[PDB]
Design an enzyme around this catalytic site. Structure first.
Site, short mmCIF file in Angstrom:
data_model
loop_
_atom_site.label_atom_id
_atom_site.label_comp_id
_atom_site.label_asym_id
_atom_site.label_seq_id
_atom_site.Cartn_x
_atom_site.Cartn_y
_atom_site.Cartn_z
N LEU A 57 33.18 57.03 16.41
CA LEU A 57 34.57 57.20 15.63
C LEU A 57 34.92 56.01 15.10
O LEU A 57 35.17 55.79 13.91
CB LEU A 57 35.63 57.37 16.82
N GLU A 58 34.66 54.61 15.69
CA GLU A 58 34.78 53.52 15.30
C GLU A 58 33.66 53.34 14.09
O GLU A 58 34.21 52.93 12.92
CB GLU A 58 34.50 52.06 16.29
N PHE A 59 32.53 53.65 14.12
CA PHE A 59 31.38 53.68 13.26
C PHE A 59 31.99 54.43 11.86
O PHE A 59 32.03 53.99 10.73
CB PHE A 59 30.25 54.13 13.77
#
Length: 146
Positions: A79-81
């Site tokens: 998700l962060e990526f």
């Protein structure tokens, strides 16, 4: 604006300790940088996607600590990526890949990274000491001054 580095990593003990003990200590105390680390700096509840996006948008850089666990589907690391790729493409957020453990099979996300994104290779215990090639390469990829 508010943070110098958002540090994205795989939510497992080994890589969390990598970020919390090894990375943070050098980045904060030897370089002077202000970090956003989601499990440290976030608020409980609220919409998770909104909290991560906001934090990334408020950071001068984002470190992707790449490892097999980071890329697992449905992970918050991915998700962060994906939100980092989004911010790269929409507001030119500069991403940095710290290659902690090499991936065991190519991942399609890596090719979403713009040309200018620095890849810095962690080589185990021998990279840890100050002035190592790892630390010099990463410092060049980070903001000019803290």
């Amino acid at each position: 604006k508010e943070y110098d580095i958002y540090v994205s990593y795989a939510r497992n003990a080994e890589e969390e300790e990598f970020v919390l003990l090894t990375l943070r200590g050098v980045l904060e105390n030897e370089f002077g940088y202000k970090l956003c680390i989601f499990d440290r700096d976030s608020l409980p509840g609220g919409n998770t996607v909104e909290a991560v996006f906001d934090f990334i948008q408020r950071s001068r850089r984002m470190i992707v600590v790449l490892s097999p666990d980071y890329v697992t589907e449905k992970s918050i690391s991915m998700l962060e990526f994906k939100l980092g790729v989004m911010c790269q493409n929409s507001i030119a957020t500069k991403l940095i890949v710290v290659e902690y453990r090499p991936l065991e099979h190519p991942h399609p996300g890596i090719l979403q990274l713009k040309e200018s994104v620095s890849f810095v290779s962690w080589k185990g215990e021998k990279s840890k000491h100050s002035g190592s090639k790892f630390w010099k390469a990463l410092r060049l990829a980070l903001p000019l001054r803290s």
